[PDB]
């Protein structure tokens, strides 16, 4: 049975090799069991300095969500997160606006909707719009990583053409696609 909570299923992975792009982080995910799991219920992380994978920086980055960590990982030079689950969205047009260091990829219903396939200092990107054809829980996954240095990850979403944006949080996230009452 899978835990039902108002969030995405989160996995953290650290490494002492360099993460340069999405494929490097995906290879890390596929190489081993997660160094820690957590519930990603408020997806607005960072900003911090001196490497996400060192010391208590992951805890600081994840903020409130860190109370659901399965373990406190040891030190690594590089690290990142893989999130997967569901997000309630009505039919319509949407776009992400993401502040991040380093890169990331967000996919909904199997289609990339926000991608930065490289390392970067903290930048905000307003991504192109996409459509949701039918209201309900949509499948979503996210990758983000830190190659070292500073780290931040805040992928906000707009339903009104970029006039207002919201964080993905427990109001609309579901780990399994069933309605959470938590
Ligand atoms: O090259 C990207 C790198 O630029 C700067 O060193 C700040 C870092 O956080 C970032 O990872
Ligand atoms: Ca794995
Ligand atoms: Ca630690
Ligand atoms: Ca249908
Ligand atoms: Ca590195
Ligand atoms: Ca960084």
From TrEMBL:
N-acetyl-D-glucosamine binds at residues 101-102, 147-148, 150. Transmembrane segments: none annotated. Ca(2+) 29 binds at residues 55, 72-73. Ca(2+) 36 binds at residue 163. Ca(2+) 25 binds at residue 2. Beta-D-galactose binds at residues 101-102, 147, 150. Ca(2+) 34 binds at residue 134. Alpha-L-arabinopyanose binds at residues 101-102, 147, 150. Ca(2+) 35 binds at residue 159. Ca(2+) 32 binds at residue 110. Ca(2+) 31 binds at residues 101-102, 146, 148, 150. Ca(2+) 28 binds at residues 18, 78, 147. Ca(2+) 30 binds at residues 64, 67. Ca(2+) 26 binds at residue 2. Ca(2+) 27 binds at residues 13, 29, 32. Ca(2+) 33 binds at residue 121. This is Antifreeze protein. It comes from Marinomonas primoryensis.
